[PDB]
């Protein structure tokens, strides 16, 4: 299974992780979708970034392989902890993220509580900001297993649907199935869930103080998160750019790889 | 007077327009403000695609140091007309085009008219939808004479103003005061000015029907035209990306040179 990578103690939890490539860091934060590992979300990422940059990507705390542990408390500081305890257990002083969609949200948090140890940010469809509970969220963090509900999940994310096949619909579904997956899952994000778009967002007051370079990109055609979040959060940030690329949903990363891993990299690259 | 470059006969007017680099052709077409020629607006643009482009940028009739025709009717469909006459007499059969404000309504306008001639499309901070004239357009198109006005013009087209030096306006002042220049610019947007944008827009429905892949590109503190407009813009446009320089106003191409040289050569690139 190549979604497992090398194992990690973090904040006290046992975590899964990739580490490729040398050279300044970027940490690489996942989604929060049924099934989701860093390796799912970031497998077309990494391999770009990896040439020029050292790329951390960690199955946050609940999610992928990393532990879950029995009666944890999960919250945005607890899932900040996580990631600033993978950043100490690594020796990683200062580093740049990128956060896609529930790891944009934890991206603006960490930035916010430990400015010092973060450098430029690329936030991905990203939470961090209110927005009204579209009909896609509630029915990604609503999932329950079965290969027809994982299609039609797949079908949310992309903008082009000939990319959700039966095959990759059947592999998911098989990785959302995992032993204790689906019952951590399933309990995250219980109705009502505009409690956790909330919960996950920053005050524009705070967003407002952010000094980084920050990056943010979007999907036009996103059906989980609003185009209307980037454009709110273009707002706030000051060293921001927005790129919004049209025909494509919210899987950037993964419907315009090309695009967002050049963008991305000369983001970086002029630091 | 680098302003001056080569002539040609196009569409009947005896043309100024600057021609550097081989390859694919590209046509870079200005804005409308007082003094404005090609040179002015892309000279920190073209040495940078003319690495791997042929680029032609030509002062549109009525403006810079190409004839103005006495009794000349000026409006969309003649400046349409000149820059296909330019294309035919350089034997550009089909190019890519960029246009600043007034040049990126022309710039739809031809795609519209001649979809065969145009390969790709970058606009920045164009004209193309209809939005309300602000106060930074009124005093643009609205300019009389004087450095102190044109200090005032600069500051309004920028972001950070120390990039306004007293020599900057009493240079732009003096090609704002050349023999006729003044005299054809005052009457070109007289009031009541919102007429010219709506006559310079093209139909939702118009524009809609674009194949053209399209780079929007806008700044975040444009004061010349609304952020909104190119919003607008990039809901209508089906193959198109937005991207929008926080920290930056209409000067794109000026206030964020590199990134904005690195974008539109990578989007050509694609091609």
Redesign the interface.
């Given at each position: 299974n190549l979604e497992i990578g090398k194992s990690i103690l973090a904040a006290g939890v046992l975590t899964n992780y990739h580490d490729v490539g040398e050279g300044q860091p970027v940490i690489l934060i996942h989604g929060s979708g049924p099934g989701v590992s860093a390796y799912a979300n970031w497998r077309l990422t990494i391999p770009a970034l990896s040439k020029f940059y050292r790329v951390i990507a960690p199955d946050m705390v609940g999610f992928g392989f990393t532990d879950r542990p029995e009666n944890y408390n999960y919250s945005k500081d607890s899932w900040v902890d996580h990631i600033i305890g993978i950043m100490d257990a690594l020796e990683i002083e200062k580093a740049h993220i990128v956060g896609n969609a529930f790891g944009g949200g934890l991206a603006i948090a960490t930035a916010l509580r430990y400015s010092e140890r973060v450098d430029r940010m690329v936030l991905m469809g990203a939470a961090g900001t209110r927005f009204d509970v579209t009909e896609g969220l509630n029915a990604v963090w609503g999932y329950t297993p079965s290969i027809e509900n994982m299609r039609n999940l797949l079908d949310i994310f992309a903008y082009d649907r000939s990319l959700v096949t039966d095959e990759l619909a059947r592999l998911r579904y098989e990785a959302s199935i995992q032993p204790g997956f689906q019952e951590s899952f399933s309990s995250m994000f219980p109705e009502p869930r505009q409690r956790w778009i909330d919960a996950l967002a920053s005050s524009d007051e705070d967003i407002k103080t952010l000094p980084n370079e920050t990056l943010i990109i979007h999907g036009?055609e996103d059906q989980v998160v609003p185009l209307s979040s980037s454009?709110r959060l273009?707002?706030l940030?000051?060293?921001?750019?927005?790129?919004?690329?049209?025909?494509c949903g919210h899987w950037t990363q993964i419907e315009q790889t090309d695009?967002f891993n050049?963008l991305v990299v000369?983001f970086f690259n002029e630091a």
């Open positions: 036009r454009l273009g707002e940030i000051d060293r921001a750019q927005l790129h919004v690329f049209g025909r695009r050049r000369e």
